[PDB]
Write a protein that binds this ligand. Structure first.
Ligand SMILES: Oc1cc(O)c2ccccc2c1
Length: 412
């Protein structure tokens, strides 16, 4: 029975209120993080989103969403902010231009949540990236796009791995810096996790941000479990070519769905990584029929299981569930292989990926570092971020000033 299968027990049968309407999503889940300027509203302002939310609520939009109808609600605000940014840049107001380009990028971003599954959402992805990089270019320490040649790609794969790159000042072959490789999630891509880069730069750490297969601009085959392996071979070849980066001090940090990829590459690329971190990742039970047949109605803001199916290149959930077992790090033998240093962190009560997958990760191969966060759901925030930064600071011998670093994340 499904109600007795997983750690959270009968919690999987209780539908979350935010699935009733956008009004319930805004009031019970999204308004607070929007006000606080945190995921999924990094770089964003409540001043931009509240008026849009008011118009969506008046229209009474709800599941099942028409994603073209949904996306269009955000475009007037996104365009308004982009025009304010363009005027500021022309006047030499660098700081103001940067702010409004990034505020524009945030509005485009939410219009194509949870993943671009319509023409207007695919449009919003391209528009979001354009204004993001315009804003990124006008930062004091500019974040740049690098189109890494996908030299390890095979037939049907893209020619480049587009990544964010930030190198601290005074980094050189003579004085090389560690690199945190951030692996993004199912809905948050390189334009979202970018919020972490200035913090790392301030601690003398380079950052590269790359998307998982079937998200953002990942060139990887969606249905091929080995496609991430090729992508990381291309990305790590490129990092090793950057002599200002110490390629003996590459730390991979996977966020949410990215955690699966961070855990996987700890095995596939052991000798090229100092450590990997899975924050709210899965490994095995995340691919279960039982888990996936319940997850659409739980803590995820939209349809988690359907979004996962799309990201893995399946036309519907049933087709994904029929083949999903082949992605398991247990089933495909990954977890039996030696791994580099691994840190697993998650909330016990996660209703996006089960904590049961931390157990599977700890039940196979070499010992791994773990922190469980009791009484917290997906990502075990906020303590998870302090746990991970404390550990990375010790690993890389940084200043250990993690409060100062975390204080830079909220948008203001
Ligand atoms: O900064 C963040 C915080 C989160 O809770 C995230 C969750 C999923 C993906 C990216 C995130 C980034």
């Amino acid at each position: 029975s499904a109600t007795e299968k997983y750690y959270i027990r009968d919690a999987i049968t209780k539908p979350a209120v935010h699935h009733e309407s956008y009004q319930k999503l805004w009031e019970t889940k999204w308004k607070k993080p929007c006000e606080m300027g945190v995921y999924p509203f990094m770089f964003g302002s409540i001043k931009d989103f509240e008026p849009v939310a008011q118009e969506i609520i008046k229209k009474g939009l709800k599941e099942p969403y028409d994603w073209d109808e949904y996306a269009q609600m955000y475009f007037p605000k996104a365009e308004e902010l982009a025009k304010i940014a363009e005027e500021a840049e022309a006047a030499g107001e660098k700081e103001k231009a940067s702010e409004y380009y990034l505020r524009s990028s945030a509005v485009y971003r939410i219009s194509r949540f949870p993943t671009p599954r319509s023409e207007k959402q695919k449009y919003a992805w391209r528009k979001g990236c354009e204004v993001f990089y315009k804003g990124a270019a006008l930062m004091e320490y500019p974040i740049k796009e690098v189109r890494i040649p996908h030299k390890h790609g095979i037939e049907g794969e893209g020619d480049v791995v587009p990544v964010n790159f930030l190198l601290p000042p005074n980094a050189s072959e003579t004085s090389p810096v560690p690199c945190v490789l951030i692996i993004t999630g199912l809905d948050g891509y390189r334009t979202e996790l970018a919020v972490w880069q200035q913090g790392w730069r301030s601690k003398g750490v380079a950052t590269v941000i790359a998307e998982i297969p079937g998200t953002g601009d990942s060139p990887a085959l969606r249905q091929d479990p080995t496609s991430p392996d090729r992508q990381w071979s291309s990305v790590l070849d490129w990092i090793e070519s950057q002599k200002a980066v110490d390629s003996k001090k590459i730390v991979a940090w996977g966020f949410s769905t990215g955690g699966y990829y961070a855990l996987r590459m700890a095995h596939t690329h052991k000798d090229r990584l100092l450590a990997t971190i899975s924050l709210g990742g899965g490994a095995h039970h995340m691919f279960d029929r039982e888990w996936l047949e319940h997850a659409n109605k739980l803590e995820y803001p939209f349809d988690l299981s359907n979004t996962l199916a799309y990201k893995f290149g399946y036309p519907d959930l049933e087709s994904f569930i029929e083949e999903s077992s082949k992605f398991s790090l247990l089933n495909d033998g990954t977890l039996q292989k030696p791994c580099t240093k691994v840190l697993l962190v998650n909330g016990n009560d996660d209703e996006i990926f089960p904590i049961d997958d931390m157990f599977v990760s700890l039940e196979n191969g070499q010992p791994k570092l773990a922190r469980m966060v009791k009484g917290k759901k997906h990502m075990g925030e906020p303590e998870s971020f302090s746990i991970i930064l404390e550990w990375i600071h010790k690993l890389l011998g940084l200043d250990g000033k993690i409060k100062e670093q975390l204080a830079m994340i909220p948008s203001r």
